[model samples]
Target: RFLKVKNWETDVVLTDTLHLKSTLETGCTEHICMGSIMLPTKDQLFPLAKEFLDQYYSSIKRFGSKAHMDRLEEVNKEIESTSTYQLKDTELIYGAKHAWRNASRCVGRIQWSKLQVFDARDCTTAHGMFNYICNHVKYATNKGNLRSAITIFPQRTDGKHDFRVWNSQLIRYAGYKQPDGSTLGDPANVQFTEICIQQGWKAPRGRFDVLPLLLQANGNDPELFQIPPELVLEVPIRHPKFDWFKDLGLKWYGLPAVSNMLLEIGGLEFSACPFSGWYMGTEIGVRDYCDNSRYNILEEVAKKMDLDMRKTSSLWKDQALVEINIAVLYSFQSDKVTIVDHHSATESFIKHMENEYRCRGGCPADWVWIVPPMSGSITPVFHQEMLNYRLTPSFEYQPDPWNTHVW
Candidate 1:
């Protein structure tokens, strides 16, 4: 009995309001769930900023007002020959918030309207971009209490003028492959680590070495600049009950500044807008720490706790996972860093989804990522059957900027 049969009977209703906003055109089809292999890429620039400009007007509830038509005319007037137009700062903030609001994969959309948009469109050089980034880190970090913030650089007028951040996140540890076939730091970043060294970086070969920012400006070669060590706030992980946990030398940065996502607002596309939100602990505890390909720390923690590592029935993995997640939450609180636990975050998402549905008839979601990494069945989201669909004014993953070059 294939799973599609379970849902096909429920699909009979074209009258469902959710279908009005979403479609079955998600990569998954009758025979397969293909969304994992293919994600929505940053679409080619539509350049018809008038349509999006109108959307900005609609957002402010001035759809057919004289000012609305006036703004539309202005966008059309400016985009005539260049085929691109700039948005007013108010317009930029409007689109940026909507982009965050429309993000389906992100569970923290409860704070969508609270994002502080740092406009960096004035920056044009590599050094200039770094300056804006430093300021963003400072403001977003807020010493210990993190803030949800995004820095939007210049828009992609064309392929040649694209600005990009080469790092997945603004602050991530370097992954070094030891000569003896072992890995140190975050293994996911081993390839990027090699690139940094090849580009004249001094490899520290240490665990938790924060990688430098590789910023590309005006489609030029990327420049590596080490983040100001003073601005980076890291929390040393420790278990509340198990004191030995601190000796593992585990720590994670406070800000989850995702640096590589592309922001799309209506027809206009911004190729680089590094947005950040406070983390839900499982992202670090479950995905970062326990994922076999990353730090792979489950067995270490399990051993430290003296769990039966060999058996599947003892719930040894589960026991170790709970403690790891608990330690992540406890350490962040102990250090006065901003972090949310999975239970609270999932509840907030449910509230967010309800608010979204009330306002817009439906809320799009990716059930796969929306469910927290650990305790799939234990969480409310795991039981929620949600529709996956594309929405505009959303963040989409762009291809790596390095690949845009010959390398």
Candidate 2:
């Protein structure tokens, strides 16, 4: 039996069974029906297939060949007949690059074309996911010389199964809530750390304990895997001119690999796609180290530098922030890790905008994110007003595993 309702305004009828049928037909279940109403169609597979073919021909310049034309026609027929079709390896690779180019919040989009894409769609176990993650960390870390790479797993289809890496990053410090309510490490990871503890995973007794990888496959219970300490490359931060800064014992990982975000390509969503790029200095210096909720080191550094902190007019916080940023850049360079400063990153963003204007007609950017967190006024992106809009083939934020049903 099917439950049905008529839309008076559009004079269209929808049914409860319609949702299930759409899932079967299009392989996208959740977006089709919300309660009693049917949402507008977001079918993008056909368009994405067409775009891939166009890019494939443009790159290879051999569209005149009968074999290429026949393969193109074959995919076109499949697209017309069904809602889902397999993407060729070349097409998947191209789509990943284009997705990086269309990522609105990234300041380092200038290197979108150089991203290395690893196809791991056949992996169906949590252990397999861990091995791939390990390889990704090792390859991208490169012992401090970071490289940009993304490993894509199978997409969610038919509401049958989904894969996810439950960690925010492959490498992150565990946060322990103290008896007095103070956080001992990264405050951001406290909840995740608790979950790991509940799952029988033991956390270290240090403030800077590295958390193990949490992975879920096919809606199964998440499994924990400890990353080898040697595979994780870290840089000891020190200021170029300030000799005492090294005594602070501050450090950060070489790669900023994001593990929790979802990668949506051509309407299909891969919830377990982990990707990485090198750091922008302020990401570590200002936010990770200085944000009150995290390390909260601004005041400590200010005291060490002997800056006046009794008054807001002293600009002690500002001075400390700049020096910390300098230390991050200097340390990464000393350790031979790829890191970009605000000035250089902003300049590269301007160049990226120009290139996008010529290649993609218009570039989408969020002004708040494109501009550097510090020294905004000096950067060109700050002066340029940007329009933010939804672009597919992009990375998206998803809820934490504990917050969702997977727990």
Candidate 3:
């Protein structure tokens, strides 16, 4: 049937709509035209039209990275046919929708309606909300809540609640036994240790602790990494009722304030390289800080010592009696070679027998050093003067004034 239009204006509108409908159902066709507009030459119309449509489709594709969302795809395709400004605005809107959808999945579909309205870049907040929702899910699933989990994994404070949540869920799932045959009662242990077992030993206990200190610290950008484990050793070695971590093969890294006692006992001088700086203290320090009272005791001893223990063997061998050892363990995880500075390497050796005896059980058992190949960096024999001295009144010998008077 010939297309009939009662009015010329109505006829033009009808022709345009029909042409658009055909173009959508089929590809670009010969009948495409604009009302009251001069038709382009064959060469210009065909080539320019195809170029325009290709660019239009490309912009649409850019706006919608995924095509599964048909409505979003259609809206973006329409916006692409309009203007870049409109495309950007629509893109932002669509991106936020996509993010919200993803965030809903991460947090939980049940809590989807409660998600605060936000833009695409607000994924961090979305992530936080998702984690919060997941925490509730975990709580409900295990017949528990945040308070109980926090009590179980007390070390995780501030923004680490997500870690604590996931950690607890795994523990509730596994309910594994510790090496001592004690039931792993909390989530932290299950997350740290048993997760390794579940993953076919693909992961290891305290891998998070080892990575940042051993591997990431050695990298050019330490800021990009974080040590997930907290300084649990800061807690008193002996408390009234709780002594769970005392000898549980715990490890920590912290920067306790350096004291003069440490320098004197270690036979270090004021001119010696400062051993105290912003760096990851080994797990050994945590053990000493917690169990042996290294910080409190050594600080007190250093305050009383008066001799220049820097250059004198008498001061090192007689005055301070402390032993120290450092060892490095190299391991491979996730196709990446990592170093584990276990306590074993930091604490043993007969090189300084006198100091070792004087400062019994005050030093680290091992130190892990991760050196890359081709660096050819030799480890210094003494990073600083060794602080292997225990306090003894026998080293209270005073300098005689008779020598000055006679001379």
Candidate 4:
């Protein structure tokens, strides 16, 4: 079943994607919604693998050709003999790009085709994985001019033998709990920070200490590897107008490499692929900096501006948000780090949506995420309707590797 929302002022009608149903079976029924829940583990892989090969061959206009059918049979035979099949280098490269294109939550899919895929399937050890990640970070950082890239580790052959990177993102600030229960550094990473400490990592206990990588390879225990400081590019956030803003000592990593998402192409699962893309201004400004559970610097910024925080009608928070966003936008540009403002990002997403519809008849998007957090009413995405659906090859969420493994 599907439903639509109508804006009375614009007389525009759009589908409320939350109510839309998928052909794929989920635990959700009419009375219960499980869109936010982690998807169940897949049990069958051969069918999906075949489907992907079909799509790949079809992309090259070879669907149903002898070569195509032969390739399919070859995979089928290999799976029959060894319980799994391997992907060719080109196949893995194409599949990774397809996964990025199909990521429903990403608004930056307009540049999805430009992604650089690094295949690390041959990597066999945690140390090797660490080296691969370091190289990925360096290449993606590009000395502040960030580039989109991904490094694929060994795929999950048996469920127990999968590789995993523990961090949600490649670069994250450590959060340590004080004796008084206050958190230092990024509050979002407290648990992970604790995990790192427990793993014998020397926690600097600083507000902006970069967390070390905990890489788990071939179901072995996660080993800690410190990223070299030079490879980790960070930009000191400064306001073009407010000279005192630099006193905040706020800086963030240039590359946003998401490490925890699982990539599925056809039926093969890559549990240890980390994808990197340039940050959008609002990601650092509106969400990371201002969210109450995050750094929560909005009130501080408002106070610095001498705004009336006592009254909601003063729009003090609103003004503070704009300046904070401006600071982030200006800082990244001056430092030569790639970043996009919410306005330009949303505009590009609209163009991407139209392009997707023209090529594939529809584009899948989640309304709550597609709309900007700061000015939802003013952004173009807030006024539009979009469908939310899943497509493969895709990046899907997996259970935390730590939760299932023995330390």
Candidate 5:
């Protein structure tokens, strides 16, 4: 009665390791399957992909000296086929984009839910969550679907940032598209969106009985739309040859020309640092390392990457910095849309600030959301390099370095 899964369509697998260094370092997790549709790399692509992966993996391994070099050796030894277990260099680039694409679908649905709520009085993260969800709902409605109500809610918590909070809750009706392609609002178009308020009490017991009273007082609904156990799918394309990092070497990190391209595509301010060591005879620097052509990619989904010294806060004027990644996944009505790209969110943005001691900080993985110059719309072929990592893994953990690297 069960459908057989093939070698191509597999569940995503990930692993993470934490470090105790100074604060806590990130780790690495490897993908089992390998192939991509964009930025093809070695072992996955014909000519350049394999060499790309080889150089990239070397670069990653070399970034930090280890307290556990032998550990990697042992892990490498256990591999049945190095080719099968490891992804080509270009896979990492596409993997990064793929991860963002999947994550963006989640963000877009969250944005749709935030629009229905009028009350701005809520916890910070919670408020932000609702706001994001509302935005998505409105966007979908504008695009001709109305009953698609998406939302994020605050879940019961033990006070942890990882899983304690519902963060956002969303719900929408199916089959609302009209004869003319317009969408009809949900049948239960409650005047106000529902919210499940948490006040330290347990569920059922913790839930306020007077919520209806408050709903009436505010002329809104007291109950939140139950988030479906399964989210819907929007876009169904897949790429196999995606790598988050490329093998261009550190020399390209701080090039103003490269940084400018990233800024234009990402809609953010760009600058490089000269003091940290990535300067190449005043012509090339560490920050100039990004693949300049990446801007032509069409996989970008939602983004918030604008950095300006005059307009932005003065705190980041001298430091090299970029915000968020450029892709994601949105689940709705039991379907999903995966936004993909061909670069590592970290390496792509950080490369622009490379070697500049003043601007050497990294970007946050969760916030990444733009890939190309386009917004919200899908442009499947903005460039010829876009490919899929046929069966790449989503999460990689590097233990010795101590950072949880997600692709």
Candidate 6:
């Protein structure tokens, strides 16, 4: 049987609607389009802008500056008229600093107000992005004396695409999966390694392979560029007393520049923003180098230290963990790279919390994250109750580019 529907000059025939629906569903599922997943609506943007403006005005009042009130009024007028508005350099810097203060996961919030914000919004080319990132790396690394910094690229505006830095961090090693079912380096970067390979990147065949920068502009194909070796400051890991530990060939970059997170300032998304701070010892020692899913070197280290691993009561794991953390702190100190120990960092965070309480009336913090993974009970933050809530002008974790199918 044949079914047909007729228009003025055309006829359409349908065999089965269910079959067509099924085919289309399967096809669309397999081939998904890539773009911004969570763009803010006009209504959302206005409220976020209002919150930021209020905070900015309050800070200005506290600092005894009334000069920027006119600019604020002008910005509000522009926001009401257009879907997007530009932020002045002062506003950009202020918003960025407050964003760090509003970061829930960071324990180094004491230095939040001191962040150096670099505006690289004019850089639209891939080469230009690389240059700015190189500058960020060198400046933040500071020849082993680290400083906190953030470089913000253009935000995603109406009809304009967002820029993206593909690397999870500005400095990270490539993980190559071998045929023997073992990973060569950082296992967290396996998917990124595959993407680099697919994009014709030549990865070095070694354990500590520094990954090249992958940058994408306006949703286009990503470009790969290697960072100049001199600009990258790396610390060789070794124990203070254990000479055999040097043979492990473990090392890590001095700076931890998180590159993949989205920096949201007043509901506007800067996807290409990369921010950095000095490392907290436990972050590299326990999580990055010793986690079961990461480098997984705890058992090996325990064996080298001649600790009894047969019994749970032996505390071999705990012993190995402490030594690894000590090695990280000692190595960074030896290399003159700025790194904060867990104890001192949390103590500073307590001070930050007190300061925020006095100034902003409250502070939002994630207790689970604020407390160091090791020595949680010893830290002052462990006993203190903390409230975690969403705040505007904050940094947020976003899905990886590969996961988003943006490549």
Please provide TM-scores, in order, for all candidate models, with all chains considered together.
Answer: 0.91, 0.84, 0.17, 0.92, 0.19, 0.86
Ranking of all candidate structures by their lDDT, best first = 4, 1, 6, 2, 3, 5
Please list the C-alpha lDDT of all candidates, in the order they appear: 0.82, 0.78, 0.24, 0.85, 0.23, 0.80
Superposed Cα RMSD, model 4: 3.1
Worst 10 residues of 4 by lDDT: 15-24
- Our model 1 lands, by Cα RMSD against the true structure, at 4.1
**Over the stretch 1-407, how does candidate 6's per-residue lDDT look in tens digits?**
22222212223222211122110011122357222123216676766776677667767774224555565567677878887678779889998997788776789999987888889999878899999999999999989888899999989875246688999999999999999999989899998998898899988858899999999887777899999999989999999999998888999999899999888776688888999999999999989988898999999999999999999899999999999999999999998999999999988987777677656656666676888989888887787666555566778777777666443
List residue ranges in candidate 4 displaced over 4 A.
1-43
- Model 2 lDDT per residue over 275-310, tens place: 999999999998999998999999899999999999
Scored by lDDT, model 6 comes in at 0.80
What ranges in model 6 sit over 4 Å off?
Answer: 1-40, 62-69, 158-160, 405-407
Q: How well does candidate 1 match the true structure in TM-score terms?
A: 0.91
Per-residue C-alpha lDDT of model 4 across residues 90-178, encoded as one tens digit per residue: 89989999888877788999998898999998999999999999999989888877789999998887688889999999899998889
* Candidate with best TM-score: 4
Lowest lDDT 10-mer window, candidate 3?
A: 265-274
Tell me which of candidates 2 and 5 scores higher on lDDT. Answer: 2
- Candidate 4 positional error at 179, Å: 2.0
TM-score of 6: 0.86
Q: What lDDT is obtained when candidate 1 is compared to the true structure?
A: 0.82
Q: List residue ranges in candidate 2 displaced over 4 A.
A: 1-83
lDDT of 5 at 89: 30
TM-score of 4: 0.92
Clashes of each: 0, 0, 37, 0, 136, 0
